[PDB]
Design an enzyme around this catalytic site. Structure first.
Site, PDB file in Angstrom:
ATOM      1  N   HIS A 214       0.690  -0.659  -0.058  1.00 15.55           N
ATOM      2  CA  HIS A 214      -0.388  -0.050  -0.054  1.00 15.55           C
ATOM      3  C   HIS A 214       1.017   1.638  -0.153  1.00 15.55           C
ATOM      4  O   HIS A 214       0.415   2.018  -0.096  1.00 15.55           O
ATOM      5  CB  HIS A 214      -0.601  -0.022   1.275  1.00 15.55           C
TER       6      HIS A 214
ATOM      7  N   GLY B 155       2.390   5.008  14.265  1.00 18.10           N
ATOM      8  CA  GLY B 155       3.191   5.776  13.620  1.00 18.10           C
ATOM      9  C   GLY B 155       4.539   5.033  12.812  1.00 18.10           C
ATOM     10  O   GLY B 155       5.055   5.790  12.498  1.00 18.10           O
TER      11      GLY B 155
ATOM     12  N   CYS C  71       4.846   1.325  10.388  1.00 19.90           N
ATOM     13  CA  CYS C  71       4.383   0.297   9.537  1.00 19.90           C
ATOM     14  C   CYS C  71       5.466   0.142   8.698  1.00 19.90           C
ATOM     15  O   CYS C  71       6.281   0.313   8.431  1.00 19.90           O
ATOM     16  CB  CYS C  71       3.337   1.397   8.546  1.00 19.90           C
TER      17      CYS C  71
END
Length: 307
Positions: A43, A145, A147
């Protein structure tokens, strides 16, 4: 009273050297660097907009090898190839990561614990131990915060990569995939209501946490009442808490021994904080009941009785 709870610091075994940052467009997340390949949540090719309904098949053919900026500190790894593996993005770099360890891609399950390396903006900020909730999510503020971070286990000189963080669910939990790009659980990489059945508060942890509190001074929340295991679970569910099993009670035996407070008496205190709230009060520098710490994370830091 105390200044908050800290989770044990576990080994990393040069896993920190395999961390890089992948930036496509305006998105920048963490990635895993092994040999001459880089792994990261696909993504990363989606701008905030392309999240309601992204078709990665086309959002990808609109990117080249230049579209991606891989960084290894102040060093840039040139992308010489890009493919997609389920929900992961495979990237071929023009060089191999020198500090790459003997590893493999296993796919653990709920219950199994593993170390997770969280990255604030990029630089590694600690290795933590986490378990896979029965619903396939993980509860941890250090992942906020972040990923594209990874979870793993170490067996001698072999690193077992078993997880990759993708998105945070509105319920405060985190969802990820194994290292093949396949999500753990019914989750998906798109902006959609999917956090159903992840709002259940982990009783076992809160309790543990409550013990950790008593061990460090906080006592005010300790009334002199008591409650049955049944009458407790009655309230447990009303407030969306994990009904506690006599099995879970065993697990809390060490701590109960150390503080000298029966697990059922600790429940009568919890039952109160659920039927009245804390009232602007605090417990280990917190105004809300915590449940990110298991009975083991607590015993670890707050040693006490030996076994």
């Amino acid at each position: 009273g105390s200044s908050g709870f800290r989770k044990m610091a576990f080994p990393s075994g040069k896993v920190e050297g395999c961390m890089v940052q992948v930036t496509c467009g305006t998105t920048t997340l963490n990635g895993l660097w092994l040999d001459d390949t880089v792994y990261c949540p696909r993504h990363v090719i989606c701008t905030a907009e392309d999240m309601l309904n992204p078709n990665y098949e086309d959002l990808l053919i609109r990117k080249s090898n230049h579209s991606f900026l891989v960084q290894a500190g102040n060093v840039q790894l040139r992308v010489i190839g890009h493919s997609m593996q389920n929900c992961l993005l495979r990237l071929k770099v023009d060089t191999s990561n020198p500090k790459t360890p003997k590893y493999k891609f296993v796919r653990i399950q709920p219950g199994q614990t593993f170390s997770v390396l969280a990255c604030y903006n990029g630089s590694p900020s600690g290795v933590y131990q986490c378990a896979m909730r029965p619903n396939h999510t993980i509860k941890g503020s250090f992942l906020n915060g972040s990923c594209g971070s990874v979870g793993f286990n170490i067996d001698y000189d072999c690193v077992s990569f078993c997880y990759m963080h993708h998105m945070e669910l509105p319920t405060g939990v985190h969802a990820g995939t194994d290292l093949e790009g396949k999500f753990y659980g019914p989750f998906v990489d798109r902006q959609t209501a999917q956090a159903a059945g992840t709002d259940t508060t982990i009783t076992l942890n809160v309790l543990a946490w409550l013990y950790a509190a008593v061990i460090n001074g906080d006592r005010w929340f300790l009334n002199r009442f008591t409650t049955t295991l049944n009458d407790f679970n009655l309230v447990a569910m009303k407030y969306n808490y994990e009904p506690l099993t006599q099995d879970h009670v065993d697990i809390l035996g060490p701590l109960s021994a150390q503080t000298g407070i029966a697990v059922l008496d600790m429940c009568a205190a919890l039952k109160e904080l659920l039927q009245n709230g804390m009232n602007g009060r605090t417990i280990l520098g917190s105004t809300i009941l915590e449940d990110e710490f298991t009975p083991f994370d607590v015993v670890a830091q707050c040693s006490g009785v030996t076994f």
